Design an enzyme around this catalytic site. Structure first.
Site, PDB file in Angstrom:
ATOM      1  N   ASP A  35      60.383  50.489  71.317  1.00 58.25           N
ATOM      2  CA  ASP A  35      59.010  50.101  70.990  1.00 58.25           C
ATOM      3  C   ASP A  35      58.055  50.641  72.052  1.00 58.25           C
ATOM      4  OD1 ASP A  35      56.690  48.959  70.166  1.00 58.25           O
ATOM      5  OD2 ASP A  35      57.274  46.878  70.707  1.00 58.25           O
ATOM      6  N   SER A 199      42.585  60.761  68.697  1.00 59.96           N
ATOM      7  CA  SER A 199      42.707  61.794  67.685  1.00 59.96           C
ATOM      8  C   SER A 199      41.346  62.427  67.426  1.00 59.96           C
ATOM      9  CB  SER A 199      43.268  61.175  66.400  1.00 59.96           C
ATOM     10  OG  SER A 199      43.264  62.093  65.321  1.00 59.96           O
TER      11      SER A 199
END
Length: 330
Positions: A35, A199
């Site tokens: 994770d 992004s």
């Protein structure tokens, strides 16, 4: 040193991925959920409330000659999906894919919430976010990667998750045969303890690319792709009959649909998520309403590049003095 381990989807939907981890002496192999959105290595154990264990493999520290109780240490964690677990702490030898850390904090669960009990395939979590998020008290502990870093050939790990197929986690090296083209690296903020990056934009299907900054986290422990409501609405508007359902808890779409791809930007580069990766199947057994793999992050407080996005790429978690992320097509 290096390590290399195969990671395997837990079910036909890629709801999560499990990677075998050796703990203790002699080794006890548990299948952990790696994770990158958390920083605790915790396991089902001989200390876990018996009624909360249902098929998981347990760590028994009393059978490990290298286990030592970390006196006074406790841990307690709550995840973004509302699940939680807590317990006490041992140090022990932990190996992943041939890479060994001695003295790793292994957090032994005394209590786990229902969703963990109900998932027999996940024996615990192995956190790979920054150690500043580790919940051990009163002495915070280091992640497996943080403990291994100095020994690694290069201070990196990579995630290569498969679509409906096994993939690989590598530690200490970049497998240049595992991706196409070049790796594009992008800046990371560690201020929230995550692999947080920005992004450069998105496209839906064959549509034009929209240049826009989207801050979010690279999180192998989250199944889906959570993005701003504007972006998600633009995606689902291209699917006839798709709608946001308050009763189901997100966007659903007709199971008869063919979904468009979704592209996200990494600098000047582009990662394409095929439409099929966005199909999470019937909302309930036999239903013709299917659950979408791109969902709104509104109310979550952060955008999450979970498995839906990451499995479309070869992803480098670069733990150099100034961390960065790298993405390549594959």
């Amino acid at each position: 040193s290096t390590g290399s381990a195969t990671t395997t989807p837990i079910d036909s939907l890629d709801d999560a991925y499990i990677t075998p981890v050796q703990i203790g002496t002699p080794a006890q192999t548990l299948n952990l959920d790696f994770d990158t959105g958390s920083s605790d290595l915790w396991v089902f154990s001989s200390e876990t409330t018996a009624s909360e264990v249902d098929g998981q493999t347990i760590y028994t520290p009393s059978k490990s000659t290298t286990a030592k109780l970390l006196s006074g240490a406790t841990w307690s964690i709550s995840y973004g999906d509302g699940s939680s677990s807590s317990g006490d702490v041992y140090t022990d030898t932990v190996s992943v894919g041939g890479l060994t850390v001695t003295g790793q904090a292994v957090e032994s669960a005394k209590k786990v919430s229902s969703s963990f009990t109900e998932d027999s395939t996940i024996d615990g979590l192995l956190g790979l976010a920054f150690s500043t998020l580790n919940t051990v008290s009163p002495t915070q502990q280091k992640t497996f990667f943080d403990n291994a870093k100095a020994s690694l050939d290069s201070p990196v790990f990579t995630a290569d998750l498969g679509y409906h197929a096994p993939g690989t986690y590598n530690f200490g090296f970049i497998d240049t045969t595992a991706y196409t083209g070049s790796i594009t690296y992008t800046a990371v903020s560690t201020k929230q303890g995550f692999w947080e990056w920005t992004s450069t934009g998105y496209a839906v299907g064959s549509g034009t690319f929209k240049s826009t900054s989207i801050d979010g986290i690279a999180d192998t422990g989250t199944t889906l792709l959570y993005l701003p409501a504007t972006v998600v609405s633009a995606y689902w508007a291209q699917v006839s009959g798709a709608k946001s359902s308050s009763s189901v808890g997100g966007y659903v779409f007709p199971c008869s649909a063919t979904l468009p791809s979704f592209t996200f930007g990494v600098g000047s580069a582009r990662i394409v998520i095929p439409g099929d990766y966005i199909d999470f199947g019937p909302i309930s057994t036999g239903s013709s309403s299917c659950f979408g793999g791109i969902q709104s992050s509104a109310g979550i407080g952060i955008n999450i590049f979970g498995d839906v996005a990451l499995k479309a790429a070869f992803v480098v978690f670069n733990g150099a003095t100034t961390p960065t992320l790298g993405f390549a097509s594959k």
